[PDB]
Design a protein around this ligand. Sequence first.
Ligand SMILES: CCSCc1nnc2c(C(=O)Nc3nnc(C)o3)ccc(C(F)(F)F)n12
Ligand SMILES: CCSCc1nnc2c(C(=O)Nc3nnc(C)o3)ccc(C(F)(F)F)n12
Ligand SMILES: [Co+2]
Ligand SMILES: [Co+2]
Lengths: 380, 380
Amino acid sequence: KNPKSDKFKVKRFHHIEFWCGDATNVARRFSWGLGMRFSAKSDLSTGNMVHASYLLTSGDLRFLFTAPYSPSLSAGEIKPTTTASIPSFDHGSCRSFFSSHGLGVRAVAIEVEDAESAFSISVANGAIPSSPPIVLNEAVTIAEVKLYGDVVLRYVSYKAEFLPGFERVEDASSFPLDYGIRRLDHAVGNVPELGPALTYVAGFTGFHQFAEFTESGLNSAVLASNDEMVLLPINEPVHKRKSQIQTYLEHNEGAGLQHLALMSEDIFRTLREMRKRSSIGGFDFMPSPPPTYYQNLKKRVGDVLSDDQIKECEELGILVDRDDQGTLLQIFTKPLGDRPTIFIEIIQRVGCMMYQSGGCGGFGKGNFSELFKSIEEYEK
Amino acid sequence: KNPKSDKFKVKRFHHIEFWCGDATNVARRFSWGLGMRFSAKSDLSTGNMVHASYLLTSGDLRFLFTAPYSPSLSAGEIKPTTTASIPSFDHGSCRSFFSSHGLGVRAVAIEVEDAESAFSISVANGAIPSSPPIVLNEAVTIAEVKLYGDVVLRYVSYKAEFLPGFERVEDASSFPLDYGIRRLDHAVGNVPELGPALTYVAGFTGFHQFAEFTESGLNSAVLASNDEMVLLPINEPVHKRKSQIQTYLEHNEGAGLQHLALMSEDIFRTLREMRKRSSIGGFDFMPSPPPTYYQNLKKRVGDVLSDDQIKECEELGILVDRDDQGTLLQIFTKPLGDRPTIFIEIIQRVGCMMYQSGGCGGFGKGNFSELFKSIEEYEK
Ligand SMILES: CCSCc1nnc2c(C(=O)Nc3nnc(C)o3)ccc(C(F)(F)F)n12
Ligand SMILES: CCSCc1nnc2c(C(=O)Nc3nnc(C)o3)ccc(C(F)(F)F)n12
Ligand SMILES: [Co+2]
Ligand SMILES: [Co+2]
């Protein structure tokens, strides 16, 4: 059941922020690979002497890419006089994050009714503060607490266009790419120990348990907001083969964000667009499951997807899972950067109409075993 | 004249190495933006636990992109047992370079007849050593000396496929992009003081002076090898407006590589391909000169380019210059990464046939004044 125990009012996922070495090159690659439009900037051309920040959007999904300039450019600034548009930014914190983890998510940002209250209530309830509430242009409020490793949960609230200090991009370079991605479905963390992480985060949010999974690799559990639109799964390693969660922890130098699942309104169109671009600057995908996996498909989702929809899953390497309430189409990219750490999931859910309920169809845990068997079935 | 005073045998430009935060994302962006094929790799999948290195090629042009892994992955290695394919690499040097300069060229690499001799002769003649000669798999030899700032000149020689330890990419991800770029024409450095830099480099190479320029921004001079195929211009600031060389030095935190000029066998095809991709992950170009610039074109190169070739220059924003021996088509990108530092020039030269002689048509110094006047002519 859903106890609806949120200690403050959470509205939805707002944005994800990557900390980069060069924000330009990462953002250009992600834009082309995922079909996200360049929609706002904050950099030297807008008067920001501290950091370069570029925002990509597709539907409601917002990806922010931030890198530091030379500290010499802002050596005369103090926090009261800063040109930074994100006043929680720090040159040394950013360099230390990137040197330790490589390219990765620094901030999981959620929109709340009041960011200052959500911060106070969180820290009162055990959250480790990262950046106190700061009010931008008397219009937006931002605050940050630690989530896991060097990832922060960022609260944002509005009185009433991304952030103050960001300039809209609607010019020539704002080409309207769109491969169908529409919003962030869930954001998954890897930690060394699940219990303490779950206890910590659920303690300061009031998020309730949504699901759990406990025999190849990991144990996980999901925290959700009251309407279960904000979904934060957390994984730990399970010590034949070496845990992929452990591989993550070793190459990331500890806990951090493992994958972002992005909802598509038409996953077949998204995967056709993304796959056409894999070899020309885009993203590569994990190897497709054997044909045996797609033979077992008609017997499990033949009532949900036509033979034509099923055959299109096989062309594209799409995975399908199903619980008692919904059906799930999913697929995974290879890692986004140099290290075998963060990757992206594309998903589309069918069912649970009331709008669609969060988590409709689960998270594809059934595909672990469905993949292990269909692999052994094709070796024959 | 050309004294042909090379203190060792230089053959040609071999490659350019970028030091990055994430080599994957920079290399994917450059590949798509410039039309360069992914042709070799050295990373975790090849057994390199130290650095990720990806090589792009177009014609004879080779761009190498390298980033460090976590040092923990190779904590048990020593230089005699290293898994690095480029043994001059150092984690701390790479992080310090990138944190200080952002994305930029670390190595200008030239092919010589014998890299060990070229290193010895260079250091004997005043070169500051960076990495002593190392022989890779008894097949290739590599050595490095300081060029300017934190840029090194890298010598490479072969007894007889890029480097030992690199695996060829000819698979699916090796899509054969090609927009016409064929080789590196020249590589330009910015320093605070031209004289000492010129004296230093010409001292240890024997490269001779090829050209010079001394009233908007800079003074420069060109060093060339005996056949004038290796061309290394160096700029210094000239202290109405602020020197763009000084802007470079401030945002780069000192001297470094300013621009790479890449020869195209068909600059009109290259610029059409690159411009179609500017807004979808590729490179942006500097703003085009006014129509007045292209009206003055028929009167200066009307004997070299048809009215149709001239009008195509205007569509594409291409600049044209001409000395007593050749004609030059050129254009400049905006900076390649976050900072207003490094950028790329595309060029194509017409004339000086004997093969074509290096530097045929000069370097476009006439376009500075030709641009200043044609701008004032269009304000009218
Ligand atoms: C490149 C790694 S591929 C292996 C792999 N990695 N993650 C997954 C997931 C997944 O997202 N689980 C999840 N998300 N939130 C919760 C809670 O649980 C489903 C299926 C597979 C697969 F094994 F079927 F591919 N995965
Ligand atoms: C984004 C900056 S645009 C301004 C600009 N920056 N560099 C140039 C060059 C140039 O490459 N000179 C050179 N190369 N080797 C030597 C020696 O000399 C020619 C023309 C112009 C221009 F002013 F005409 F554009 N430039
Ligand atoms: Co998932
Ligand atoms: Co040039």
